[PDB]
Amino acid sequence: AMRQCAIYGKGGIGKSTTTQNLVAALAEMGKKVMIVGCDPKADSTRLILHSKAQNTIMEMAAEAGTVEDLELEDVLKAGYGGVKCVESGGPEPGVGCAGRGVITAINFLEEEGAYEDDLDFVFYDVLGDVVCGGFAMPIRENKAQEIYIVCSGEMMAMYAANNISKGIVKYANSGSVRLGGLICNSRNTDREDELIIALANKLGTQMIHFVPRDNVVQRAEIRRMTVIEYDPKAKQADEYRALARKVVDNKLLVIPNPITMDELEELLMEFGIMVE
Template identity: 55%
Template sequence: MKKIAIYGKGGIGKSTTTSNLSAAFSEDGLKVCQIGCDPKNDSTRLLLGRICSQTVLDMVRDNDEVAAEDIVHTGYNGIKCVEAGGPEPGVGCAGRGIIVALEKLRSLEVLTDEDLIMYDVLGDVVCGGFAVPIREGYATDIYIVSSGELMSLYAANNIAKGVKRFAMRGGVRLGGIIGNGRNTPNEQQLLQEFAKRLHTQLIAFIPRDVIVNKAENNRQTVLQYAPESAQAGVYRKLAHDIWHNENMAIPTPMSFEELEKLVAEYGN
């Protein structure tokens, strides 16, 4: 079983990227489960065609006995979908939802026959809860989604620091940077150099395309909405490259001053 976690700054396109990857992997005949680790519980929206209202945290909070069918839902092409959920806005710790959800899934032993588990994880790893997928060995292959914008790169660099810390304890490794284009100056070249400085690779650069927005407006992945489009081909190639990726590394994060200098060099 391959266990992959997709990290990145909030709003950078992690859920869109993860969902399209899950769809591409499922097209290859793999048994896939996608686990959303975000209190907004919107990671699996494009796979289910709706917001998942039965999150693990909600079910555990409201029921003494929780069965697998209460929290594992079936989406596009048979993909299993799970949302960790979280507290009401302004109340409690969002990271706690991830801890409770993953512990419950482990205790129910519901994901033992999958070929691939995809974790879609919010933000960086400042909060211990969001670090659980890599800290506790739930995921071993880490990919970071980033654009060429400074704050996106800053979050990616912070995530790399967390991966480095936990890589010293076990088998977790960084598989690469997934560039999600925002049409900033010299964006692809900047991301390539950023990846090089982190001792990893730019495994893909996903160009900005309106077909992604149209698919999302129809609550579908690009692979479902426009399967013959060039953008669908980009996601399929990325899935292939991730599945066969052997370039797994312990990252070498940069200082913020180095990062600012790098962005200035390429962005001005």
């Protein structure tokens, strides 16, 4: 068995930092993991690979001729802890559908046998500001059974979590895509943990971990590493280890209950976020 997990959330919320650090912690534990980057920014694997980024399947297929001319062994790259990494890529801005590369990439990985029995986890790192095209494909086509949404007390981030939840509900009649939890990536605001707990309860899920804001992240990323590798003794490293443990142990996978904008605004008002 392997658990197929997707990390969604609005742009800049911390998807790639959280995913790569969570996955590093999983590898530290002895799990075999593959990360599939599904965001056109295409830097979802650089902290595992110690790299600027990673050349994308779309780029490599164009240089090879067709995606069929690509070999999996040429595409997947292994970094920290043996974690395997691939990037989908996507068309340039203003050219065709921004998510088109996700479809190409996931189909290529499936056809070429990338989902080997020995894997314990696959994590897709997916752009979540729109839920359509290739960005909806992991949900629509039943590729990621466990969705974890990174958010924060920011209204836009909670709105994005609600939108992603609506996409999960839309496809609940087939497949088995479920909401696994919210991950609060802290903005250092008061009662933010309570706010995301309350949001999760309304959606029917849980807040699986509160990730503190910690500058060690920036120092590790300047050096192209996860915090796990950069400073295994850092407090923030233990935070990512706690998140990884709870993901491993998680058994709550639900069809969520999306909320109204009135309910979102009520949450914000309640927890005094809108704080000096």
